[PDB]
Design a protein around this nucleic acid. Structure first.
Ligand SMILES: [K+]
Ligand SMILES: [K+]
Ligand SMILES: [K+]
Ligand SMILES: [K+]
Ligand SMILES: [K+]
Ligand SMILES: [K+]
Ligand SMILES: [K+]
Ligand SMILES: [Mg+2]
Ligand SMILES: [Mg+2]
Ligand SMILES: [Mg+2]
Ligand SMILES: [Mg+2]
Ligand SMILES: [Mg+2]
Ligand SMILES: [Mg+2]
Ligand SMILES: [Mg+2]
Ligand SMILES: [Mg+2]
Ligand SMILES: [Mg+2]
Ligand SMILES: [Mg+2]
Ligand SMILES: [Mg+2]
Ligand SMILES: [Mg+2]
Ligand SMILES: [Mg+2]
Ligand SMILES: [Mg+2]
Ligand SMILES: [Mg+2]
Ligand SMILES: [Mg+2]
Ligand SMILES: [Mg+2]
Ligand SMILES: [Mg+2]
Ligand SMILES: [Mg+2]
Ligand SMILES: [Mg+2]
Ligand SMILES: [Mg+2]
Ligand SMILES: [Mg+2]
Ligand SMILES: [Mg+2]
Ligand SMILES: [Mg+2]
Ligand SMILES: [Mg+2]
Ligand SMILES: [Mg+2]
Ligand SMILES: [Mg+2]
Ligand SMILES: [Mg+2]
Ligand SMILES: [Mg+2]
Ligand SMILES: [Mg+2]
Ligand SMILES: [Mg+2]
Ligand SMILES: [Mg+2]
Lengths: 200, 166, 419, 64
RNA sequence: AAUAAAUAAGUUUAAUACCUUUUGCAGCAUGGACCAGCGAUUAAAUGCCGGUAAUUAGCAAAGUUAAACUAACGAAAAAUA
RNA sequence: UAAGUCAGACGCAAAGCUACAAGGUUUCGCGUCAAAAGGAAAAAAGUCCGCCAGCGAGGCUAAGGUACAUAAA
RNA sequence: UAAUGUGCACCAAACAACCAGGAGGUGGGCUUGGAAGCAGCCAUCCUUUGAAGAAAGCGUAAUAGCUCUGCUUUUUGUGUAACAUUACACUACACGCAGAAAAUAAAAGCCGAAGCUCGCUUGUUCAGUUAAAUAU
RNA sequence: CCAAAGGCAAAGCAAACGGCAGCUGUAACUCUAACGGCUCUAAGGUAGCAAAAUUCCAUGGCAUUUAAAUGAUGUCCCGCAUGAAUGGUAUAACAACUUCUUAACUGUCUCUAUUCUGGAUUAGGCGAACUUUAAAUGCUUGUGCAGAUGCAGGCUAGCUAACAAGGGACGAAGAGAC
RNA sequence: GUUUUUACUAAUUAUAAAAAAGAAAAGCUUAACUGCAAUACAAACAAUUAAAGCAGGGGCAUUGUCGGCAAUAAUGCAUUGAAGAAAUA
RNA sequence: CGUUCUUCAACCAACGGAAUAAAGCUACGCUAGGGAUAACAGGCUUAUUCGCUCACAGAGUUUUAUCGACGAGCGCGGUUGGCACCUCGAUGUUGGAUCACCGCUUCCUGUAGCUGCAAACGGUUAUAAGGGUUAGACUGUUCGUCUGAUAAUGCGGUACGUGAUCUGAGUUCAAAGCGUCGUAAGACAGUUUGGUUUCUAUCUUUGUUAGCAUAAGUAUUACGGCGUUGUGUACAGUACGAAAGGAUUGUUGCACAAUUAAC
RNA sequence: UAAUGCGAUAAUACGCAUGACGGUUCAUUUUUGCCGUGUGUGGUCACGGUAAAACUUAAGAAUCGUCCA
């Protein structure tokens, strides 16, 4: 046992049992545990149902030409690309890369959590049904280079890996769901002309 | 849990099984008058921390003194305690001594580096186990026993208590 | 050195799902599944990594599994699994390829499941989108499944068939004979394609190469050609008949029966042909389903063959029909085994088929009631027992039709058959 | 843990290992409750074991 | 260790060079004032083990060199005649 | 892999040697460092929690905390 | 040493304190130039009985005397080298100090990592078995 | 003193190379041993000198020298381990040799002060060298490859240099000699 | 080495070996062999340790045992040299 | 002449044994390397050393006034040791000169108790670190012995403080002598005489001064530096005491010394 | 296991003779302590072991003594 050579005892025992089984047949021929083994199942408990959520973003049309925007007196909170944003018309936000949309398209955001004005507030638990936010896709860009560097002193170890993140830019156009307080109504045209191209 | 293999459970060669002295619970025997040995020992032989059995009592006297902690006492300490007890109690007192220093200890002189073998004997010691009875008295009164206990307590490194037969 | 004593015990049994490393083994696992329950578990464990290729292949596997249960109703687990695969198809409705759609339709059609009308339109749009650009990439096997798969589903969109036919027309001369035969089957089944240029092109493409047709496809081609082209404008029906005469002995029993009936419809039957058919049909009468038994009776009756002492074919057919209706084969096997409690699945024949068989036997000219042991006695005796348990399905018109057949054969006393 | 109080390496502040605070005591109480609770559950499972063991599906076992 | 991440631009927070050598170095352990140029597992013969091909190789030109191969127990009976 | 390595260190727990000393020395069981960034204890190779493919102004926790420095009763 | 708790022991008077006696055989016998209670031994008995040891101690050459174990009223929780817990001390950061503050939370809760998780990015890991037309 | 182990030579040679003991008893009181006994060797150190340029106990004991002497001179002496041509003991003269003392003299000192000449220091001209990983380079205690300008706590708030001093930068010079 | 007898059950450098076993006493003997060997213990390698069984010639018994000694120490590779025998040239 | 089988022997005991065999000196030394490894200093440890508490035995003999022990515990980092953690591409040795900062375990100058304290001279405990802590003979010394004075001539830490400020007597290179050891080269860890001590200050620390930056003068308060010393004598031969001897007290008086400030 | 066991001529034909009292030697795991492993701020944790060591009350068996209550 003092020796560090690996032991061959398991190999010697296996060769003996194999030789006996090869030449001498067994007496028993059944095993009850195998006979009554039931079918394989996925689990022993009912599955847990999932909680529905409103749609994140969907296209509704395109923008035809240059437009202008004016300031309004309402705001809201919307969930998008894993993070929440407080938005009001004519704001610009930066998110992760969104797939399936193009520049000069109008999208609809439905995961609205809070709506507010100067006279009332509406709180979602956790979402408000019947509210939405409209925005225009303005950019799909690569952000500034981020330089990633690692080194270990005195270990001859060095790594350099520059990278460029992908992001998307949006401009908020309209917030729907809550009326402005009395005297705060915008009584003039505000947004662009939208060509509707999404009928379900 | 016991650390042995399957062949050992069946064909062990350790037929005559003795419990090691360090953990044996048997009470120590009465001291004898044999001469001190001149054979060096190992340090474990002078230390034993396992408690005494739960049936220990006085064997000869009516009063005694016991140790509440383990300790290692030298021959010099025992002689000083013996004189103190003899003077404190009386000339006409019956005393039983249940301990004796028998385990040699070695030491090396100043200015010697590590190595070149073990040293030579310097003195003798004895291990003390918790709850052990050290001295017994007879032909005295209880107040005299308490005086003996207080006299020796400052001279020992372990806590002491009084035992009475009933 | 030693921290545990004893022999290592059995490993714990852990429920696990498929990991991303084994996403390439999903197609293999589908093939290795040997039952509906196993396939259901394979799909469930791989739910997070399912793709349109996997959904289409699973539906095709339903046909392979159901084949092992021939002669019985579709099992409940197969129906339940099909109800789930349909939902997946709806999610991936617009991401399938032309080759994958063909597999999906064939599998669901084989199980005799009706796809929703909206799904068929979406699936149809995929095939014919972009002016049939992808049709030029579908191979022969894909084309064969597309034609038969959609036809079996009852799809009746004129625009879809018009565009599909136009794209396939230039490729007909290079398709195999078996593929062309399937196209003819669809053309004959669709009324609005009866007299189109595509229909004529198909016939002209099949004539040059007929020696490669298999027995099953050969019979269908003759049936379709006769219906579409009663007059031999193209030398197809004449060539098909010549092949039937030359290799009549080599074809299987089912195809010979079907082809013989077609000849009688064509009015080219002869007493010599009828005499030759009888010995072969009598020997292998037990290898003909109820549908082919009806064809055999009509063909022989039209040919004019009369019952002979050496080969009483009509008597044998009547007994065989009774066995199929009663399903005595399962009971007979159980008698030898000794366990009569064995479950016996069956596919009950429709009442319409029962009436058609009864009329044919009546027109045969043989009696069943008067004589104690008549050739047609066993069939009518079985019919009475079956109808006793199907009185709810019996209607006034059905009762009258059977009564006419009963009167013709010679049983009109309102009493059960002797046997 | 470190109990040694000698040497130049200051594992503990001067004075040795410090006594536990009230929060540390509460932390150790909850760690032991979890351990005791696990043992109580295993006792319930043993007293309510079925006659036939359930068979659970595994893709890797299926392949081989 | 003279920078980094931020900011209402006022400021706030994080943060003891590199190499060599060591059980362990901000090291009060070793080397470098800075810039440009020069400066260190290369070639031959032979052997072993993988990969890629030819399907023996070299001369000569119906004949010669090199390599490789060359006896182990002649053991099957599948005829619905 | 016919490669590199044959200078090891400490914590908790034992035994021999030393003086039941040493950040001492010799064996042995587990862990960490060596070759391991991040968080807590003041700075913190070896203790406690825990193993860094990359980016983000999202969320829940571990050890440890919850009048100021300093996030939270 | 101190603080707290447990065990045990004692408003028929516990504990602290004021008010009176501590007698006679006796100054027991012995030793002694002196011993009575105290230079030193034997002895430690008797009586009065409101108490008292042949006086606990200070001293007197012996005396005398005080007060002490024990005595009546009077006002009046205590004791305990028994045990357990907590926190301190037994003498040199010999250049210069661990912040401010501090007589009340192991609480419903919450803070807290490059751990887990959410959004985005990079690399890595061919098969086709069905025929379900009622035509004369 | 030529034995043993060598060298040389005419079988001999020591001013060739070399060596030259120990134990024990004894004289009036004491002490000592003039005087005996024994063992061994080739031979057993004779005269002379001796706290040494040679002495471990040690700053040996006594006398002179000073107010005070690990000093100097003399002297006592089996001297750890002196000794007679690797010479022993003395010796007038001589010595930029080592040691102690006397006379005189003095800033060597109590205790320093003033001053002259030159340099430093101020101005013009001319014009090097050691050194340098990068610097915008405080104190104190704690920490740590175990003695910190650079890490943690407690402190520190006009700016750049000149003349002067030399605690620290484990200060510079020479790949530690031990 | 091996057979027989019984008023015996020890000793070793050290040691709870051993009763169908040993020691002593009596008799006969040379297996303290020739040529091989399955399978294991151990072990970096070299070597080191135990051993059923087959053939030949023997010993004591009369069908069992003997390839030295109760067991655990008494040792030394290759090279070079030497001796007995045998086969070549 | 060569090969095989059966066998043995020698040196391998540094016992895996082979370059056939086979001793020393170096202070005249040289090269390549290590803080992987010693000598000086730092660090860890505290056996030893030193201090305190308990212990109150024993001497004193009423007193734990004073002296003082067996034994046990704790503390200090200054004595003798142990370990090998930092430095060998260099961290200058002992003692002294010069100039210093700190602790208190107090030698003198203070404060308060006890005493086997009449006075004087003392003993011991608690508290107190402002000032002071001498000149010489011997010795390279630290130390130690001695002499004349002094209020008294304390101990320890600071790289056993201090050589980019000085010294070089000892120790520790090359020369030489003596004694002892070695056949010899040589060695002493014994002794004696002789024997080279470099540096122009860049950063930080410190003493002075000028320029520049918010006009000048007077400036309470605050902050920082410095540290208010010692001896003799008179008030008195008085208190005390048989005699002898001989004081206490003071924002005291007077003379002198050191230190500091100037002139 | 009375075809037993023991014996003083010790051989076994003969001697004692299987009961009853007394003294010796050999169950709720008796249930406490203690030990081992894992985890651990050094124990308000878990499981197992003691046919290795201390510790309870029985009942039976093997000798031995005995004119027997
Ligand atoms: K430069
Ligand atoms: K000479
Ligand atoms: K001279
Ligand atoms: K300097
Ligand atoms: K060797
Ligand atoms: K060095
Ligand atoms: K003082
Ligand atoms: Mg340290
Ligand atoms: Mg927690
Ligand atoms: Mg090192
Ligand atoms: Mg350099
Ligand atoms: Mg090595
Ligand atoms: Mg090693
Ligand atoms: Mg170590
Ligand atoms: Mg390394
Ligand atoms: Mg939270
Ligand atoms: Mg806060
Ligand atoms: Mg992660
Ligand atoms: Mg001489
Ligand atoms: Mg001379
Ligand atoms: Mg000048
Ligand atoms: Mg420091
Ligand atoms: Mg600092
Ligand atoms: Mg060097
Ligand atoms: Mg081997
Ligand atoms: Mg034999
Ligand atoms: Mg043998
Ligand atoms: Mg060797
Ligand atoms: Mg050198
Ligand atoms: Mg080192
Ligand atoms: Mg080491
Ligand atoms: Mg003091
Ligand atoms: Mg000093
Ligand atoms: Mg010094
Ligand atoms: Mg200096
Ligand atoms: Mg010399
Ligand atoms: Mg000489
Ligand atoms: Mg000589
Ligand atoms: Mg000279």
């Amino acid at each position: 046992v003092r020796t560090k050579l690996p032991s061959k005892r398991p190999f010697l025992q296996t060769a003996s049992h194999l030789a006996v089984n090869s030449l001498v047949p067994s007496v028993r021929t059944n095993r009850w545990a195998d006979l009554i083994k039931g079918p394989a199942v996925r689990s022993c408990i009912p599955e847990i149902p999932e909680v529905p959520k409103p749609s994140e973003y969907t296209t509704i049309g395109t923008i035809e030409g240059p437009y202008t925007l004016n300031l309004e007196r309402v705001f809201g909170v919307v969930e998008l690309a894993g993070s929440q944003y407080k938005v009001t018309p004519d704001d610009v936000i930066f998110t992760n890369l969104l797939h399936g949309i193009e520049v000069n398209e109008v999208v609809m955001l439905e995961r609205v959590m809070l709506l507010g004005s100067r006279s009332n507030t509406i709180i979602g638990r956790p979402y408000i049904p019947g509210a939405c936010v409209l925005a225009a896709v303005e950019e799909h860009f690569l952000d500034g280079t981020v330089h990633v560097f690692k080194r270990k002193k005195r270990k001859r170890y060095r790594r350099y890996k520059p990278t460029r993140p992908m992001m998307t830019t949006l401009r908020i156009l309209k917030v729907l769901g809550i009326d402005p307080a009395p005297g705060d109504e915008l009584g003039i045209p505000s947004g662009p002309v939208i060509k509707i191209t999404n009928t379900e | 849990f016991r650390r042995r293999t399957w062949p050992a459970v069946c064909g062990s060669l350790h037929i005559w099984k003795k419990m090691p002295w360090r953990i044996d619970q048997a009470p120590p025997p009465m001291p004898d008058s044999k001469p001190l040995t001149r054979l060096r020992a190992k340090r474990y032989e002078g230390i034993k921390k396992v408690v005494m059995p739960n049936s220990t009592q006085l064997q000869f006297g009516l009063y005694g003194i016991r140790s509440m902690e383990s300790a290692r006492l030298k021959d010099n300490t025992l002689e000083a305690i013996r004189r103190t007890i003899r003077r404190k109690i009386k000339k006409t007192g019956r005393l039983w001594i249940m301990i004796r220093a028998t385990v040699p200890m070695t030491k090396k002189p100043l200015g010697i580096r590590m190595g070149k073998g073990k040293g030579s004997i310097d003195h003798y010691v004895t291990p003390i186990r918790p709850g052990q009875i050290l001295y017994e008295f007879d032909r005295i009164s209880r107040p005299i026993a308490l005086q003996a206990l207080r006299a020796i307590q400052p001279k020992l490194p372990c806590r002491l208590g009084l035992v009475e037969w009933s | 050195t030693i921290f545990n004593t004893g022999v290592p015990g059995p490993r714990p049994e852990v429920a696990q799902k498929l990991s991303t490393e084994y996403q390439g083994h999903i197609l293999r696992m589908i093939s290795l599944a040997e039952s509906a329950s196993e396939l259901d578990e394979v799909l469930w464990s791989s739910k997070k990594h399912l793709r349109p290729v996997h959904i289409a292949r699973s539906c095709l596997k339903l046909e392979y599994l159901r084949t092992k249960e021939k002669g019985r109703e579709v099992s409940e687990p197969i129906k339940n699994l099909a109800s789930e695969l349909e939902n997946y198809v709806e999610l991936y409705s617009t991401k399938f390829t032309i080759g994958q759609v063909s597999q999906l339709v064939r599998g669901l059609s084989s199980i005799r499941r009706n796809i929703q009308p909206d799904l068929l339109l979406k699936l149809a749009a995929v095939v014919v989108a972009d002016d049939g650009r992808q049709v030029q990439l579908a191979n022969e096997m894909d084309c064969r499944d597309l034609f038969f798969g959609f036809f079996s589903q009852g799809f009746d969109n004129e625009l879809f068939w018009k565009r599909l036919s136009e794209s396939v027309l230039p490729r007909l001369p290079y398709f195999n004979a078996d593929v062309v035969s399937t196209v003819l089957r669809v053309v004959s089944g669709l009324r609005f394609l009866h007299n189109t240029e595509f229909a004529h092109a198909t016939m002209t493409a099949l004539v040059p190469k007929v020696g490669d047709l298999s027995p099953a496809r050969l019979a269908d081609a003759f049936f379709s050609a006769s219906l579409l082209d009663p007059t031999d404008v193209s030398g197809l029906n004449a060539k098909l008949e010549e092949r039937f005469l030359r290799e009549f002995t080599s074809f299987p029993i089912k195809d010979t029966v079907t082809m013989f009936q077609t000849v009688t419809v064509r009015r080219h039957s002869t007493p010599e042909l009828a005499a030759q058919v009888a010995p072969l049909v009598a020997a292998q009468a037990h290898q003909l389903p109820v549908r082919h038994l009806r064809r055999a009776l009509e063909g022989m009756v039209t040919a004019g063959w009369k019952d002979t002492a050496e080969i009483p074919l009509y008597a044998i057919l009547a007994k065989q029909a009774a066995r199929l209706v009663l399903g005595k084969q399962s009971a007979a096997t159980s008698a030898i085994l000794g366990k009569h409690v064995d479950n016996q699945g069956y596919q009950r024949t429709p009442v319409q088929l029962l009436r058609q068989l009864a009329r044919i036997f009546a027109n045969t000219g043989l009696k069943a009631g008067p004589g104690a042991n008549q050739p047609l006695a066993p069939y009518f005796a079985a019919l009475q027992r079956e109808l006793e348990g199907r009185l709810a399905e019996l209607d006034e018109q059905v009762t009258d039709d059977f009564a006419e057949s009963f009167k013709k054969v010679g049983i009109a006393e309102g009493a059960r058959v002797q046997i | 843990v470190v109990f040694k109080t000698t040497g130049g390496k200051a594992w503990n502040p001067p004075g040795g290992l410090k006594p536990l605070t009230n929060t540390q005591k509460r932390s150790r109480k909850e760690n032991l409750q979890i351990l005791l609770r696990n043992l109580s559950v295993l006792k319930l499972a043993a007293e309510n074991q079925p006659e036939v063991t359930v068979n659970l599906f595994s893709p890797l076992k299926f392949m081989h």
